[PDB]
Amino acid sequence: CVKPYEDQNYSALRRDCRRRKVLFEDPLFPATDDSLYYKGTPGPAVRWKRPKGICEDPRLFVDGISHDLHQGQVGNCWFVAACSSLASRESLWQKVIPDWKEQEWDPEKPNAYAGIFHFHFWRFGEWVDVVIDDRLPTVNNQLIYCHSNSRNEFWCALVEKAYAKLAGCYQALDGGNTADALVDFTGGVSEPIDLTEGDFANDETKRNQLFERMLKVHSRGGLISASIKAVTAADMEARLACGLVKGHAYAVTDVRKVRLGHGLLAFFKSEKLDMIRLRNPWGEREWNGPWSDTSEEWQKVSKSEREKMGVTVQDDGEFWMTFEDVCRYFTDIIKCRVILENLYF
């Protein structure tokens, strides 16, 4: 059985609260400024509210897991990236969020609810079970850390609160990063690649090397995310000319060699292309360049043929780029190999 974090038994505490008809209040991560800021740091005055008090009909998922994500006024972009990737694959987010339908709110049987949730994380070679109450920071009845576009959706917010419990307090998460978060989420191993320290845009042969590895990781069920390094503070969330955002990271949802049919060779001058599909976790795609759905390249290829090639999308959140452009515009790739042994036990 999965090891309880800090001697907290979810189902025991839950069934207690139900028998007593009270909503769980966590003693080890209380609804107070100590769960928020470092000792003696002055932070914003906050109001901890329960989801009912934020928006009626509260849900873990409104429809499905991958609605837009926002970090908020004081949340961390890297955590949004990490949640986006985690949301990619049912097998993974369903590991961090156990028995999701047992946890989800139910309008019928309302006395199911007990203000309590539990998640799994991978720390020091084992799955720990982190228990929390569902009270969250609020300012103008609005979540100020991570949340989704749908104001009655909470999975991202609660996963965050739990992750912050593991770090000690919210403000600690400013030190984290997408790579380590994916390891804590999947049990795997992370590897970063710095594109501007590797000069992949200016090589091709190593770029092919890198690409083949990514084909390998993704085909094996690993996770990849691509980010643009915001170096200065003035860089944070600056839009590039091609539309991508400095300081954001984009979840790779497909990596693929595509073969183009004869007759396209006239325009493209190649038979095979190294392609990536990414998701913008923050909403509708932004990419302007080749293979944006508004690009000459996209328009030169019939829907019939894109379908045959597999250059499709689930929604306007996704977008295709050639791996040459990926190396031209991104600064880093996180490459988190999944380890299957760690999931099955």
From Swiss-Prot:
Keywords for this protein: Disease variant, Hydrolase, Protease, Thiol protease
Entry superkingdom: Eukaryota
Ranges for domain Calpain catalytic: 23-339
GO molecular function, one term: calcium-dependent cysteine-type endopeptidase activity
Keyword Protease set for record: yes
GO biological process: proteolysis; signal transduction
GO cellular component, one term: synapse
Active-site annotation: 77, 248, 280
Free-text tissue specificity from the UniProt record: Expressed in many tissues. Strong expression in the photoreceptor cells of the retina, with a punctate pattern of labeling over the nuclei and inner segments with less expression along the other segments and outer plexiform layer.
Disulphide-bonded residues: none
EC number in record: 3.4.22.-
Associated disease: Vitreoretinopathy, neovascular inflammatory: An autoimmune condition of the eye that sequentially mimics uveitis, retinitis pigmentosa, and proliferative diabetic retinopathy as it progresses to complete blindness. Patients present during the second or third decade of life with posterior uveitis and reduction of the electroretinogram b-wave. They become more symptomatic when cataracts, cystoid macular edema, and disk edema diminish visual acuity during the second stage.
Similarity-based family: Belongs to the peptidase C2 family.
Function according to Swiss-Prot or TrEMBL: Calcium-regulated non-lysosomal thiol-protease.
Protein name: Calpain-5
Name of the gene: CAPN5
